[PDB]
Write a protein that binds this ligand. Structure first.
Ligand SMILES: [Cl-]
Lengths: 276, 276, 276
């Protein structure tokens, strides 16, 4: 003998056809069932079912109950929803290392190769080590993303009007018309359809045409602009106003009136020379 | 018999109460222990412990040692730190397919449904296939994020001053005062508190008021501006300077002096006509 | 006896040295092999190999076949490529709960601690719950990233020219030369190297110098600018043009010619007084 079993209680019952029943109180019923240990049971229609260890209940068909007081709790499944799997799954049985009120760890596993090999904590730690980089990057991206929201909306607040009015706080305008132009070299222009033309010129105003070299127009041939609030020229190069003109205009007036009386002077002389 | 064991060495010892001891040299001590195979041992307080296969050592209580020279290396645990799990865990035993110096693969596993079913490489490959999309996206985001840092900081370098001075490289200013205005239609304005008013006008300068139609002010009623470095008008519409004024002013001078002597001419005649 | 086996067919063969053979038709050949159940086989060089349950084939060395009609399908491996693992792996055997045409679930597993403990669906669900946050964030980032592409490229389209020409649609220019300047306080300037100098002034034009208080230059000492299309001043402060000048110029002309004949008048009188 090389099969010893130190017990005295009710004997093993290998009942089902071609069973196998070992240890005290071990009833085995499912055909081709196997029960090993103290008080194990392989129930009725648990075809080919195995219960190995104290109080182990092989409940299901083709499935297994391993270790003290483990049950089978599922059995073979058909077209079942496996976690993460995109298409119905199938199972020919179950291998249970536990029960409803007690699970066990599975220890000392080499990593996995085939898709139907078991995975281990070490293999999972590689994913998590990645996820946690994608994680930390997403935060590092969030701030970058946020700071560029506070940076851009400074531009659209700092600028903004320069698009609309086409101006700045010290360079306003109020126009709907066509776009301005600096045709000739070195030129400047201002206002609606402001056609500069000649060299070094300036077409200052809505629809103004400076079409001669070095000039500074304030209008066109038909529409022409006055120049208000101007000072009386001092240097030879300074512009002259009406206050200085009128002064001349009135100076002419004296001249005419002095001359008026001179001619009435000379008529009288001439009258007298014929007379006296 | 349907239980054969081709051996000759020391006999199986099923020592502990209700043990089970099979194969040569197989000592079994833990109560309700089970040892099957060559030279297996279920030690002292390895209650309900199973050692199945060559030199297999069931060391712990309620746990299992499966396969040639596997040991149990943990046993049931209490409030233990499981990987990735957020709350203490519990274990009623261990199922070992190996030992310190040799682990095994677990093969031919259907995917997992319940949270306490084993996971397989295929199920993990679904996560990794995702992670690696989040991964590649994060890179695709990084460049986009970076290129918009080099794009925006061109705007704040290309522009920048237009916020500060309210100007461009050919349109400067130096003012702290209030904002300019183009009140009337078609108008333009320039400088601190530059109040344009009338139609088509221009209020050129810090605090300048062009309040009449089509005009071009360079000041207000009290403060008024000269116009330096101006050319002598040629066309009927061109502005006139002092160089052309003085020339008139001096032309008047001749006129007065010629006239001065004319009147001293006429006095003498008149003197003589009374005389001779 | 506590080892019962209800059968009648061909007897168990424990052939290999120190084998163990249980149940009908169970041939066991590998040395130290163990076969338990109906029609199990532990083949030739399946050293220490275990086949437990109906038609179970222990094919490989040191490996295991568990449950009705499971095979070993790999055996111990050497320097093998494990999924996700960065360095060759090793395995001392295999623990099979299935075969080519039928896998099983492993149920009732406590989570995993060591790197070589089995992982369970619950432990994987923690990773996926994260991944799916990194996922949803990446989408939330994508839109943010995209909307800031449509926001910035409005700025470079809304602005754009203001960098190039240094202007707006109503404030043009055409110059390559040096940058403008508002040296003195309260000042404005316009054009290439436009050197304003005095207070409240304006240096309107490419290379123009307004170097006196409150003035409005349109050039420098050598280069000086005309002012085309100007209106005839009305108020005392309004600029005067040639149309008003010429009118004076011609008014002088009358004055001279009236005076020409006055002097030829007076010569004749004087001639006559000597004569008659
Ligand atoms: Cl991720």
């Amino acid at each position: 003998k090389y099969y010893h079993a130190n017990s005295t209680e009710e004997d093993s019952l290998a009942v089902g056809t071609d069973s196998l029943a070992m240890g005290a109180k071990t009833i085995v019923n499912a055909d081709a069932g196997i029960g090993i240990g103290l008080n194990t049971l392989v129930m009725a229609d648990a075809i080919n079912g195995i219960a190995i260890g104290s109080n182990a209940r092989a409940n299901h068909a083709n499935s297994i109950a391993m270790g003290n007081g483990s049950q089978t709790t599922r059995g073979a499944q058909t077209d079942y929803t496996a976690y993460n799997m995109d298409t119905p799954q199938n199972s020919v049985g179950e291998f249970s290392v536990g029960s409803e009120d007690g699970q066990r760890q599975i220890t000392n596993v080499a990593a996995g190769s085939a898709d139907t090999d078991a995975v281990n904590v070490g293999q999972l730690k590689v994913t998590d080590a990645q996820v946690s980089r994608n994680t930390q990057s997403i935060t590092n991206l969030n701030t970058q993303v946020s700071n560029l929201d506070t940076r851009v909306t400074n531009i659209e607040n700092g600028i903004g009007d320069i698009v609309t009015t086409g101006s700045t706080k010290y360079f306003k305008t109020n126009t709907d018309g066509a776009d301005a132009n600096a045709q000739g070299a070195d030129s400047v222009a201002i206002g609606s359809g402001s056609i500069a033309a000649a060299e070094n010129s300036v077409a200052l105003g809505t629809n103004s045409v400076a079409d001669e070299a070095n000039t500074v127009s304030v209008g066109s041939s038909t529409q022409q602009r006055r120049i208000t609030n101007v000072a009386a020229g001092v240097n030879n190069t300074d512009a002259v106003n009406v206050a200085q003109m009128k002064q001349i205009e009135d100076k002419i007036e004296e001249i005419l009136s002095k001359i008026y009386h001179i001619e009435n002077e000379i008529a009288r002389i001439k009258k007298l020379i014929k007379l006296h």
